[PDB]
């Protein structure tokens, strides 16, 4: 395919997010590289406006699923790559249990040889001393399955999952993730049979980064049809 060929090797990634959570405004800039042959993402983000007003883990899902490794027998179900280089719009609502919600719109496209994910985030109705603005979340992440089905109505895909954020008191906070992806261009795209992506994440800190930051490593692989 045309889009698939853009991902045969490692491609650099730029991510830019403008966010407003409960009126608290911030901006985050991140860089890294993706390698869809391994299904691997490596990224580092800094908050350029000072201290991030929400926990870094809550934004992991928001910060380029075109880098998933799709097994050889499944390449015709990879909506993400098939919508490239035109790219896709990724709109999503993340509902935090007994707390506020995020609404996100991202455009993920190629600019030159670099894959860019440009995000807009609006967050509302958050408890000011909740687990989010209260920074009560442990700095870690678990493995999850992302459920994907086609959406012919939009020539796109509908995708859902539930994130499990570990709380510092031993409890867990569920963030119900609903996201929709639609191509911008007019070239044909594959709408896949139902399947899923197994995702694993590891967060860390660069000891030499004086700025509020996060280092994210992800492994993502498609499965679920045989």
């Amino acid at each position: 395919s045309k889009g698939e060929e853009l991902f045969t090797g490692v491609v650099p990634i730029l991510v830019e997010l403008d966010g407003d959570v409960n009126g608290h405004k911030f901006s985050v800039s991140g860089e890294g590289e993706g390698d869809a042959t391994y299904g691997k993402l490596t990224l580092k983000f800094i908050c350029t406006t000072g201290k991030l007003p929400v926990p870094w883990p809550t934004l992991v899902t928001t910060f380029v699923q075109c880098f998933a490794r799709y097994p050889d027998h499944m390449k015709q179900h990879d909506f993400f790559k098939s919508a490239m280089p035109e790219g896709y719009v990724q709109e999503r609502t993340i509902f935090f249990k007994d707390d506020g919600n995020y609404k996100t719109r991202a455009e993920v496209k190629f600019e030159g040889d670099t894959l860019v994910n440009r995000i807009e985030l609006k967050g509302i109705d958050f408890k000011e001393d909740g687990n989010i603005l209260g920074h009560k979340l442990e700095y870690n992440y678990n493995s999850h399955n992302v459920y994907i089905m086609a959406d012919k109505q939009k020539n796109g895909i509908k995708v859902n999952f539930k994130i499990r954020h570990n709380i510092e008191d031993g409890s867990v906070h569920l963030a119900d993730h609903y996201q929709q992806n639609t191509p911008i261009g007019d070239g044909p795209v594959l709408l896949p049979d139902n399947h899923y992506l197994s995702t694993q994440s590891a967060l860390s800190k660069d000891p030499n980064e004086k700025r509020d930051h996060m280092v994210l490593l992800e492994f993502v692989t498609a499965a679920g049809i045989t």
Partner: nanobody
Amino acid sequence: MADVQLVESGGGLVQAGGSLRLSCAASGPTGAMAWFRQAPGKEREFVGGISGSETDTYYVDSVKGRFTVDRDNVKNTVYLQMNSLKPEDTAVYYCAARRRITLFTSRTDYDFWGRGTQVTVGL
């Protein structure tokens, strides 16, 4: 992508409380550009920089208010104006640049380095 050089000028000797300017010229276009410093026993640490977008500037707390970084995207140059110097600012200062725009502050995130120019506050 590589083979871009950084040429430092300025610095030198000054009396405590004075002012000195560092300047750095790049052989070609570059992204975020910053200055680091190296005390003789310690090993280089970030002092201040600006992103290639020039939308983000950052200074360490120990320098806030006294130093001013600015850049000329056309001449491919940057400068650091240092005012109200203190004894603890004595060090070898390095110009640094990277291919991409994000103003990271880790030494490891920078792909190009000047030779280092000594600034000594001490009269």
